Design an enzyme around this catalytic site. Structure first.
Site, PDB file in Angstrom:
ATOM      1  N   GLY A 118      10.544  -6.342 -13.034  1.00 36.75           N
ATOM      2  CA  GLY A 118      10.263  -7.691 -13.507  1.00 36.75           C
ATOM      3  C   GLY A 118       9.140  -8.419 -12.802  1.00 36.75           C
ATOM      4  O   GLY A 118       8.884  -9.581 -13.114  1.00 36.75           O
ATOM      5  N   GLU A 162       0.826  -1.213   0.000  1.00 33.08           N
ATOM      6  CA  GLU A 162       0.000   0.000   0.000  1.00 33.08           C
ATOM      7  C   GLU A 162       0.861   1.265   0.000  1.00 33.08           C
ATOM      8  O   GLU A 162       2.050   1.195   0.290  1.00 33.08           O
ATOM      9  CB  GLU A 162      -1.011   0.003   1.186  1.00 33.08           C
ATOM     10  N   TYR A 193       5.187  -9.426 -11.650  1.00 32.41           N
ATOM     11  CA  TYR A 193       3.914  -9.617 -12.339  1.00 32.41           C
ATOM     12  C   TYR A 193       2.904  -8.724 -11.631  1.00 32.41           C
ATOM     13  O   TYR A 193       2.438  -9.040 -10.536  1.00 32.41           O
ATOM     14  CB  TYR A 193       3.489 -11.098 -12.323  1.00 32.41           C
ATOM     15  N   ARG A 206       6.734  -2.942 -11.886  1.00 32.61           N
ATOM     16  CA  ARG A 206       6.610  -3.381 -13.275  1.00 32.61           C
ATOM     17  C   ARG A 206       7.974  -3.436 -13.951  1.00 32.61           C
ATOM     18  O   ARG A 206       8.326  -4.460 -14.535  1.00 32.61           O
ATOM     19  CB  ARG A 206       5.645  -2.470 -14.057  1.00 32.61           C
ATOM     20  N   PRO A 261      -0.711  -6.683 -11.742  1.00 31.17           N
ATOM     21  CA  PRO A 261      -1.999  -6.599 -12.458  1.00 31.17           C
ATOM     22  C   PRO A 261      -2.401  -5.158 -12.798  1.00 31.17           C
ATOM     23  O   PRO A 261      -1.764  -4.215 -12.343  1.00 31.17           O
ATOM     24  CB  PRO A 261      -2.985  -7.241 -11.476  1.00 31.17           C
ATOM     25  N   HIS A 266      -4.595   2.565   7.934  1.00 31.57           N
ATOM     26  CA  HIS A 266      -3.339   2.174   8.564  1.00 31.57           C
ATOM     27  C   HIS A 266      -2.508   3.403   8.941  1.00 31.57           C
ATOM     28  O   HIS A 266      -2.508   4.391   8.201  1.00 31.57           O
ATOM     29  CB  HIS A 266      -2.541   1.252   7.634  1.00 31.57           C
TER      30      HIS A 266
END
Ligand code: Q5B
Ligand code: MG
Lengths: 402, 616, 78, 90, 90, 78
Positions: free
Chosen positions: B295, B230, B297, B292, B299, B272
């Site tokens: 390397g 976050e 993954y 990103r 979304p 938080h």
């Protein structure tokens, strides 16, 4: 959370508690704060030094062409009578000027910078007269360090005075629960040390251990925003429990209201609303977690419902009661409080064309979802109820697109 | 192994009396087929003792210790402490546990712990090669091996998310609630998590996400790493730097929440404590972009997190990196009775009925009437007795006759059996309750408790048509004293004014006194024989109460017969005389009375002979 | 707690008790007598209620008792 | 009790009743040896009514019910329940 | 009492009797949860015999006699006397 | 005093009790149970003796009681 404090409060803390670490009590606590309902004659009787010293008056609302330097008490009243309530835009935010700090003008030549911030390994002291960084380990402390090895370039006569001042400032930072301190700039008054501008943040979690040092201060609202009775009521509930109940109003006239469980999930629900282009309609950012009781969730739900039923909006309004699958928050007890508030706001809910969307999992969730389904069949407002079979944030496009 | 946090042999202490969390841990141990519980002892600062909990359907005992050093010395095999101390004591209790040579991991649940305290706990943990999970976290869990307190909620959720068997995914988050949601997402899109940890949402945690990610990288059982971060702080930059330095070779799924922040005001502090982007670098956009480029993954949004997990898992499955395994048998656990009862699944009959009062609602009820209405209507003590004993709202004069009786029998001096025994117990230094009961236990056929029998015998004689002389004659032939007749000190020569006072009230207020008139005829006959055979106060109360019930209109013939048969009226003497018994007990305490021993000169000691005890 | 505290205020303020008399009342323990006397009304009522109901003998259910006998080893030594 | 008329702290029972001192006034005489002000005697009576019963589940009522179910007489059953009155209950 | 045979601190009543543990041995099991040495069980039995009675004049015997003279049943009379056992007597 | 003291010596010397077990026995109050149990034999005997003797109701003699009522002045104030 790290909370900013007025220059008035930070300098008053430094004037009161720094002479306990440093033996140079040259900096007196000559400070005056001017708010909207401040009687000038009362502050004049409280601070006799005002009429017999050259002054500096500047706004203290957590911030340029606004600092008034070297003036008489009469000239200070002229600045105060003109700038009070002035509509000004700072950082894109348009708010009125309401708080001002009055302090003596210190005629100076030198301007040195000092700042204390923390990292995962300890605290970092920053100094400049380009900028040196001195790391203080969490377990070892300042005593383990020879602060003396600082800038040779121009310091010499006062290198020992700055070494002593920044060592005391770290102790002040460490024992008074600060999360950030910045004196930009500081100067010398003979052999003494004088702060000219001060920016400070206190770690609000330190409150229980700082009842004596923080006795004379309160956290101010950021520039532009006005205090909210509803927000302070939720903060009051939150203070008497280990559970979390947080509420921030973003737009009172917003169509989309949220009552999401958890710090993590509430941010994700806000991300989804923004990703669908409804940031402007996002009426609030809130969260409840840590297993709050029925009464606590009831008062929380009542406050969101109250704020949501003040204005009537043409396309109706949407209430998103979401959250992840809880680990320990009782869904039956929390949703019992939510159902009790919705029952009370029954007439106001129908009149405002409000649609309720629910997605929840966790301890006793089947019993909690049953309460919401039974409520939707008698309240007279649409209540779409979902469980762990529905994707967490699927109620957001279902309410804003469908 | 250094990379393993918890295994099936992990033993733990639970600091704080959190009975639900204790049960959740034991239930997980049971469904995971553990041989013994994962909890060695409970640390309860308020009390040492025992705690009873379930192991499936069987009840077991867990020891409870007052301090951390006492528990550690008793159970040195326990290397984990699940700390439920408040934010006011979380630091000192975690630091005490970290100083114990045998404790290696401490999970800090408390929210609101100062940033400085967390910095000191994190540095202390790193210096001693120990682990601090938290503050402000549920904890985490190793699938099929151990759970920290409430991590992963209900056993139903554990079964639905297949958390009783490990998978190939190493998971780490900041959020506690999202750690449970992620367990569900990952189980549906892969073979599930092997281990999952929530580091908490504070900006200075006890352990950073990378600490756990590095352990997953060394663990051969884990073939996939997944994390959910976050905005605020620079924790995720430790992962991106490790990803760039080729320290993480396993495929890593990553998503940083807080993409909403630039659309909203800069002043907004999120849930938080650490969720506030102070700099551009701290934002979710800067973090997701750097992820990103490193390397990972990443979304498009949180919505496609499970899909990215599915893509990475499927890739490992086709390439042979991960192997498909046979699903183990689904474990079972009995439902708690309280849950089955609340959901209406079961019903259970009550053993008792109560018809006289109800304390279970918003307000106490006496025979269905709210205590407030009893008091507003000034029903008084007599009206309360009418409700609780007779289940009637009596006429005022009937409630006042009950109050008159209580005052009239309150005390009759210290010499009577009940007052005498209560005084002897008080002189023996007994407390008020013991002394009171010592005296109340003398109430029976000769002293006080003749009221029920007087009501019974006079009612029978008068009802069956016996003339007063025939009743006196019949009782004499049976060798049975007439109950309510006779007295130790009151007589024709010394009349009992208490009897006169009860009779004047009944004549002035009762619609009829037929049984009293009959009783007074019996008294003329008994006193003609012996002057001490007067109608005594017990006989007077019993007889007048029958006239009261018969004439007030509130009782049917059956109700009166039930009152007589069951014996209500001796209760009036026990209640009234308790006033004088308590008074006599207190009088002896004020007087500083000494222990009583009955004088020997008042006892004739007449032992049997040796011959008498040897035969018949 | 409410009865005990209010009775002290009653004795202190009614004018009928000296400081010594109040101290004696507190030291000797009078006030529990009020609860014994008052609660005897409801106790007698509950006793009579069970007699009217024709209630049977009660025996506590076995399923509400955890029988945990000591081992032979435990009873032989300490 | 030894004279022509019963006395409660020196006061004839007749005068106690003629003056309508009530149950609270009788307790004032027998326990405190005082003729209390009326509101003090009424507070004693208010307490008696307020604590008369608090359901069948409390220790004292529960024990008295068990003794009554065992076929015990009223006095034995009453004392069985009164003997639970102590530091935790009542 | 819930099984095929009554157990006193885990020991079958049959084995308690076959081993002639006696009344002192039963008290060792029920009060102390110990199978006591024989001389310790015999000291308990010796105490019971020695304190069985000390005449009718003592507080407990006196109160039990007064309740019995008042026509009370054995149990009520017994408890009337047992309730005098405290700091000064027994 | 003799029973209590000797029971401590018995527990201390028989080998069946640890120092903690003895401390627990002393703190909780077991030993008065021995007198209640033993003396119940004589109490039951005295009760039965009075039933065999056909004893009458007892009332304590007035001549053994000094009745000392407070004055009207004493009950009106402190
Ligand atoms: C009251 C007393 C035990 C006295 O016994 P005594 O031991 O003195 O007499 P006994 O040895 O039984 O016999 C003497 C001779 O008269 C005959 N005779 C006696 N009673 C006779 C009778 N009822 N019916 C026919 N005949 C009778 C008997 O047949 C024999 O004659 P004979 O055969 O020719 O040699 C006795 O009367 C009795 O049991 N009454 C019935 C029970 C009863 O109603 N109790 C309530 C009394 S109110 C109370 O408890 C409250 C109190 O007022 C108490 C206080 O202040 O004391 C307070 O507020 O505290
Ligand atoms: Mg939370």
């Amino acid at each position: 959370a790290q909370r900013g404090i007025r220059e008035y409060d930070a300098k008053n803390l430094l004037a009161r508690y720094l002479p306990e670490y440093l033996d140079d009590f040259s900096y007196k606590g000559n400070l005056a704060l001017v708010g909207p309902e401040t009687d000038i004659e009362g502050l004049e009787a409280e601070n006799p030094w005002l009429k017999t010293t050259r002054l500096v008056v500047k706004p203290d609302q957590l911030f340029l062409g606004l600092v008034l330097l070297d003036a008489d008490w009469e000239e200070a009243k002229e600045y105060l009578n003109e700038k009070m309530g002035l509509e000004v835009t700072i950082g894109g935010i348009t708010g009125r000027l309401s708080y001002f700090l009055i302090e003596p003008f210190t005629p100076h030549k030198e301007e040195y910078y000092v700042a204390i911030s923390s990292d995962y390994e300890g605290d970092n002291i920053f100094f400049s007269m380009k900028v040196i960084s001195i790391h203080v380990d969490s377990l070892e402390g300042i005593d383990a360090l020879d602060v003396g090895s600082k800038l040779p370039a121009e310091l010499g006569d006062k290198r020992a005075l700055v070494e002593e001042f920044i060592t005391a400032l770290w102790r002040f930072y460490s024992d008074t629960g600060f999360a950030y301190v910045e004196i930009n700039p500081f100067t010398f008054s003979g052999r003494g040390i004088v702060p000219l501008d001060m920016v400070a943040k206190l770690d609000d979690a330190e409150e229980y251990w700082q009842k004596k040092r923080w006795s004379e201060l309160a956290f101010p609202e950021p520039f532009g925003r006005t205090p909210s009775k509803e927000e302070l009521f939720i903060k009051e509930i939150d203070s008497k429990t280990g559970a979390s109940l947080k509420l921030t109003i973003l737009n009172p006239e917003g169509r989309v209201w949220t009552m999401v469980a958890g710090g993590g999930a509430s941010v994700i629900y806000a991300d989804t609303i923004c990703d669908l282009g409804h940031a402007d309609e996002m009426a609030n950012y809130g969260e409840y977690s840590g297993d709050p009781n029925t009464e606590e969730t009831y008062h929380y739900t009542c406050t969101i419902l109250d704020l949501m039923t003040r204005s009537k909006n043409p396309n109706g309004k949407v209430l998103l009661i979401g959250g992840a699958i809880a680990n320990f928050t009782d869904v039956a007890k929390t949703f019992k409080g939510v159902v009790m508030a919705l029952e009370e706001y029954q007439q106001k809910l129908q009149e405002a064309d409000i649609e309720i969307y629910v997605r929840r999992g966790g301890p006793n969730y089947e019993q909690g979802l049953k309460l919401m389904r039974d409520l939707g069949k008698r309240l007279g407002v649409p209540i779409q109820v979902h469980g762990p079979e529905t994707h967490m944030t699927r109620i957001v496009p279902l309410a804003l697109e469908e | 192994k250094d990379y393993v946090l918890f295994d099936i042999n992990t033993k733990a202490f639970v600091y704080g009396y959190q009975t639900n969390a204790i049960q959740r841990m034991l239930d997980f141990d049971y469904v995971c087929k553990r041989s013994s519980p994962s909890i060695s002892a409970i640390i309860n600062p308020s009390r040492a003792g025992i705690h009873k909990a379930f192991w499936g359907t069987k009840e077991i005992i867990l020891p409870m210790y007052k301090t951390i050093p006492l528990a550690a010395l008793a159970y040195p095999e326990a290397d984990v402490m699940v700390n439920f101390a408040s934010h006011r004591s979380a630091f000192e209790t975690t630091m005490e546990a970290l100083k114990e040579d045998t404790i290696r991991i401490v999970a800090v649940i408390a929210e609101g712990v100062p940033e400085r305290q967390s910095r000191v706990m994190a540095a202390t943990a790193r210096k001693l090669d120990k682990i601090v999970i938290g503050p402000a976290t549920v904890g985490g869990m190793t699938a099929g091996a151990f759970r920290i307190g409430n991590t992963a909620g209900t056993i139903e959720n554990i079964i639905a998310s297949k958390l009783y068997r490990p998978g190939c995914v190493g998971f780490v988050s900041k959020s506690g609630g999202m750690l449970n949601e992620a367990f569900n997402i990952i189980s549906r899109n892969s073979d599930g998590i092997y281990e999952g940890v929530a580091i908490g949402g504070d900006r200075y945690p006890g352990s950073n996400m990378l600490d756990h990610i590095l352990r997953y990288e060394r663990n051969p059982a884990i073939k996939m790493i997944a994390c959910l971060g976050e905005l605020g702080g620079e924790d995720e930059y430790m992962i991106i730097q490790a990803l760039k330095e080729k320290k993480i070779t396993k495929p890593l799924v990553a998503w940083v929440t807080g993409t909403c922040s630039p659309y909203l005001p800069a002043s907004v502090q999120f849930g938080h404590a650490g969720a506030k982007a102070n700099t551009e670098k701290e934002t979710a956009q800067a973090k997701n972009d750097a992820f990103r480029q490193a390397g990972a993954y990443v979304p498009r949004s949180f919505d496609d997190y499970g899909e990215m997990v599915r893509q990475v898992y499927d890739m490992l499955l086709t390439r042979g990196i991960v192997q498909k395994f046979d699903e183990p048998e689904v474990p079972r656990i009995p439902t708690d009775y309280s849950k089955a009862l609340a959901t209406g699944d079961i019903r259970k009959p009550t053993t008792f009925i109560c018809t006289i009062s109800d304390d279970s609602g918003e307000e106490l009820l006496y025979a269905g009437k709210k205590l407030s209405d009893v008091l507003d209507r000034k029903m008084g003590i007599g009206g309360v007795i009418g409700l609780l004993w007779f289940k009637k709202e009596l006429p005022e004069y009937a409630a006042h006759f009950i109050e008159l009786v209580i005052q009239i029998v309150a005390d009759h001096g210290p010499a009577v059996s009940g007052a005498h025994n209560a005084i002897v117990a008080s002189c023996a230094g007994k407390d008020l309750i013991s002394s009171l009961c010592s005296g109340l236990l003398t109430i029976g056929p000769r002293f006080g408790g003749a009221i029920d029998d007087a009501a019974r015998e006079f009612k029978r004689a008068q009802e069956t048509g016996l003339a007063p002389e025939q009743f006196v004659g019949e009782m004499k032939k049976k060798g049975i004293n007439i109950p309510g007749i006779g007295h130790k000190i009151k007589s024709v020569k010394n009349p009992d004014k208490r009897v006169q006072l009860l009779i004047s009230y009944a004549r002035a207020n009762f619609p009829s006194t037929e049984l009293l008139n009959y009783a007074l005829q019996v008294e003329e006959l008994t006193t003609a024989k012996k002057g001490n055979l007067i109608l005594n106060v017990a006989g007077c109360i019993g007889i007048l109460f029958i006239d009261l019930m018969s004439s007030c209109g509130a009782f049917s013939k059956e109700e009166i017969d039930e009152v007589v048969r069951l014996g209500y009226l001796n209760g009036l003497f026990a209640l009234g005389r308790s006033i004088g018994l308590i008074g006599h007990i207190l009088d002896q305490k004020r007087l500083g009375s000494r222990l009583y021993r009955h004088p020997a000169e008042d006892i004739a000691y007449m032992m049997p002979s040796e011959e008498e005890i040897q035969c018949k």
